[PDB]
Amino acid sequence: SYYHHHHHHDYDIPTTQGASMPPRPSSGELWGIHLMPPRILVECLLPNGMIVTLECLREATLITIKHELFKEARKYPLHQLLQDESSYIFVSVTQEAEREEFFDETRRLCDLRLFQPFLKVIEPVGNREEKILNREIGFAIGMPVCEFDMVKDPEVQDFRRNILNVCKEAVDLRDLNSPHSRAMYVYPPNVESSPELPKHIYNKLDKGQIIVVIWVIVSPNNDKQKYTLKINHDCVPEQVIAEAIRKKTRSMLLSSEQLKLCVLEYQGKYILKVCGCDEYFLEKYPLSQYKYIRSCIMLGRMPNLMLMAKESLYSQLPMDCFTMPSYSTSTKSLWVINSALRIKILCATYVNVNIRDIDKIYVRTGIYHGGEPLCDNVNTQRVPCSNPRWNEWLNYDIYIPDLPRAARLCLSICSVHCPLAWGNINLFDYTDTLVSGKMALNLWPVPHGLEDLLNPIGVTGSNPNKETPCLELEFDWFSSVVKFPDMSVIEEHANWSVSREAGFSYSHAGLSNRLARDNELRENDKEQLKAISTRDPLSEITEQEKDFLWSHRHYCVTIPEILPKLLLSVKWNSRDEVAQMYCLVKDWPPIKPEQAMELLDCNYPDPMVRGFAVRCLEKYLTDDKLSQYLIQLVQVLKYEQYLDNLLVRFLLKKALTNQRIGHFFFWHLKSEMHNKTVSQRFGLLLESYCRACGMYLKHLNRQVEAMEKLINLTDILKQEKKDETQKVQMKFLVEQMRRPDFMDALQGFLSPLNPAHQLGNLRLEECRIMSSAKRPLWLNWENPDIMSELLFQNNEIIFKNGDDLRQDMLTLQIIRIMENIWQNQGLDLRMLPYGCLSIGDCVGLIEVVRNSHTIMQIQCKGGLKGALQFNSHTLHQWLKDKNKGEIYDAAIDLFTRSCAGYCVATFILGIGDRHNSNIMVKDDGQLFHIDFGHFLDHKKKKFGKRERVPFVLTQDFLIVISKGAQECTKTREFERFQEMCYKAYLAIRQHANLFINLFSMMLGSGMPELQSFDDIAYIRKTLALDKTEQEALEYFMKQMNDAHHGGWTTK
């Protein structure tokens, strides 16, 4: 009567992942087995053709193995046909399938990635041993470099040889005024872009003065000595270095004059370290500008620097030693060709479709430029399904000269209306050459939240996966290799079309893009242009406004910021128009980077436009602001038409100039190396970076080697050792971590979250598997700095095989920006954008925040013994218990400041709904969210105008906001909080363009939450950009009011 006695006949409980952990798999130490047996048999192939099979330990070095092999081969035949062992080097096939010579004989048998447990012995062929340490580069990259040498494609090979231009130029800048310039590469100053101090920071400073602490070391080393100065915030490291040496060497035996002389000799032998990490203060900036200082001031902390001798620094920095790699007709202008474009389709081959279900199938086509220059067309619905073939010439209504440089054919096979496969080709090659002949294109499947027929934004070029729908085709061939015009030629045709327009006459019906106004335009026009200028990138422009812009294209040079709008008004199918645009863009006023990144998204594919945008960055974008937005600039590379371009040459160079950038530039590229839409491109790029970054390669190699071990470790825990007790697992973990290969590979290296921190010697006592079913590891390390004690003695970060970090990675980045926006406008909401870093396919790292707890923990600790009901006040009680005295008042301010910001950030981004097990409170009272989930409202694809409030302030929070009141909604404490939320919400609304653009640039990545621009459009409604800002506030008040049911209706 429950179920109307209805049987579900099919349902079987004999094993039916619903009943965590979704990616997998990735084989480890030997083919098909995660961890090789602790003792194993290895077949040693000798020069004399004998196969002696040694039992070796898993962890044994090739020195050890060889040393014993040349004992045990004596007992075999033909011993006198072998040279001394030192005349030999091991070699074998790896899991990457490449015969790898084993030079570093200190390596262990497990760490070789070996496929079959066997080792051939040879004398080292190719005498040039050092350059066969591309092994280092191929390890760093995780594909062998020889996999490139045997790629046919000229572009690839052209990229590798030409990109060295950029490498050589960087390495030049490095050893310019060495060693200082070297030290500057490695240890660049970590500084804000602004020297101006926010008003709230200055007020903490005792009218512009900090108390600092310089520490020094004398003999033998051990004893250190404080020298607590009280200097001006805006004085430089040199000045501070002197004031320490002064106080150090004042004396009852030295006159005042005798000090001055002993200071000068001493002063410039020293530089300022930060105690506890490898940050330095290497150039003239206001101390307050260095990030460490400004954080110390915010946290009520007294800076702890160390005087370090320049020679003990330049002791550590080894030479970069850059070496060049072993890889060291006339034509017909497009505009001559007088025919419309036609493209011959031929045969798809491998199309997998149910002929029962699906009627008939065709090929849709179109030309594109982000948006399309003509009518989209198909072919007829022929040889449907049962072996599909159409031998048609499709005819496109555009003349071949009116093709823009950046034009690309998009195509797709469809059903009857539903897309099967897709793939897009560049209509010109990287050498400017109009494509002509026969082309083999293997296709890509449509992704998850993609309903549309065709996929223009998707990546250009063929799938490299063979066994996929290979839809071949043919391009019209005009007896000659047709090329795109020179600039000289386009300038001429621009200047012609210019003067041609001057003689056009009186009326024009659809003058529309002809002015008729002359040099004198009306005042209402010049107002409607700055009106447009300001509108965000997603407020699509009307055809009126487009032609309106396109007419007054020349007055648009007065309002540079209009350019992104202007460009989307050009008709790219009229080379008359396009040529003229190429001449405005030639000498357009450069603009702010925040605006100029719009121009490297998918909707601005032209080379000249994208050049201008890089020219902007080259001028304005600082190394600080670069690493703020590096995620987005690396992502934006996918929309570049060809391997070799200006954006790549910019970033590669920045990477090779500043090693903090370099570090993250490696990891973000390496992050995406699994994804074959980029594996070639990024591989090639990563090769270049690695070949030129000098000694950081060797550092990166340790980091990589450490992550690989951890990946394997968790791969084992999440298979086979599932369905075992945490008890049993943790035995297995520690057992494993103790083995020498792990001890080697996991102990001395740099945090990938921040290579400033060193990691040495893991404390295995505090290392453990967290409770989650994804089996995240909680790892702990000794801070091996000389001054560990002054910063943290223990360094600890969580490694999580199983979850795709890159949504987290981005939201935290967005938060980080909202903070800096807010703070550098003078208003102190304190967000905690904790560190996150994806290093692979659902693999990454999360910074631990010591002394912080999920609200749920608070309430489980503070709740009464007789499990009845948890108290609203326990949060407050737990908080009071921490902060007592004048301290109490300040903790509430902080909770209220953070809680205010997170309220607004959360709402605007639409992040996953908040509740007790994903909100966190720190001992000092700051609140901050974690585990954000899907950002722009991605449960909305089910049903969805939900304009959600995800941070819904329960009683708990409200109590705490209004000290400890009853009916909290009515205190001035809360009035304050509300106004924080209102002045926060607006301040972001003023930078809405940026946030749109940042989200726009991330469409590249295959994040499901960012498939196309209307995903991004959630952020419009929630910031309320179609309204006036007075309305927007009222929208936000309303929106906030209904989630809490009362509180929000005064101003």
């Binding site: 075999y76 490449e98 209307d1014």
Partner: protein, 244 residues
């Protein structure tokens, strides 16, 4: 009539999503324009401003559009307004609302099926290539062992013919043992590769089969979705979220 009008920003683009070439509708800052003709053309929406007595001589919003339903837009500026765009006709309110719950449970089941199969598909893609790489690695492994049984014969059968009486079968038998191991190992290796290739085909067959059913699910996933949206469109002419 002007308020009803049949056809009369983000959700405009969603109503435009996946309609054919020609489809349209009319939209409403007042200090900007008045109305807006959104018109879909080949996978790109095209926005046209409406300036308001005259909306120049056309005396209404309904006036100007009926004129361009028959005709192209080319003569005003260098396609027509062809497409001005069931539910079991249930004049029920409550019973159209349970269908909304049920089509949503059909849809949301259907999406799981499509979401599951995409993992199966992609894991299968990877696992296949892992095999292909492994086959190359096998083949390479094999070649080094083939090269070995070659390598021995040369230096082996130099030390058969020099001397012969010295050692003789105490020499050559223990040389011939080594060789017998060498080739029957290659025997195993080659079989290990074969045995991988067969699995590749069975994998690749299932690879095709996943896609085959993915593609069959897709078109009905759209119509299930499309009928659901028209159902929830019919109702709306805060109560919804429990069904959904």
């Amino acid at each position: 009539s002007l308020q009803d009008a049949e056809w009369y920003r983000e959700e405009v683009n969603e109503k435009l999503r996946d309609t054919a070439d020609g489809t349209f509708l009319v939209r409403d800052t007042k200090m900007h324009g008045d109305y807006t003709l959104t018109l879909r053309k080949g996978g790109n929406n095209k926005l046209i401003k409406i300036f308001h007595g005259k909306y120049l001589t056309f005396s209404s919003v309904v006036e100007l559009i009926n004129h361009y339903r028959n005709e192209s837009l080319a003569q005003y500026n260098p396609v027509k307004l062809l497409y001005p765009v069931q539910v079991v006709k249930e004049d029920n309110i409550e019973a159209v609302g349970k269908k909304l719950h049920e089509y949503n449970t059909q849809f949301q089941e259907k999406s799981r099926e499509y979401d599951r199969l995409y993992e199966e598909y992609t894991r299968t893609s990877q696992e296949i290539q892992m095999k292909r790489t492994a086959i190359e690695a096998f083949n390479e492994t094999i070649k080094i062992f083939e090269e070995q049984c070659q390598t021995q014969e040369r230096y082996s059968k130099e030390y058969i013919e020099k001397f012969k009486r010295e050692g003789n079968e105490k020499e050559i038998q223990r040389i011939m043992h080594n060789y017998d191991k060498l080739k029957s190992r290659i025997s195993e290796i080659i079989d290990s590769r074969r045995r991988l290739e067969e699995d590749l085909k069975k994998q690749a067959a299932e690879y095709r089969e996943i896609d085959k059913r993915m593609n069959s699910i897709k078109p009905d996933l759209i119509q299930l979705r499309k009928t659901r949206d028209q159902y929830l469109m019919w109702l709306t002419q805060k109560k919804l979220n429990e069904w959904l």
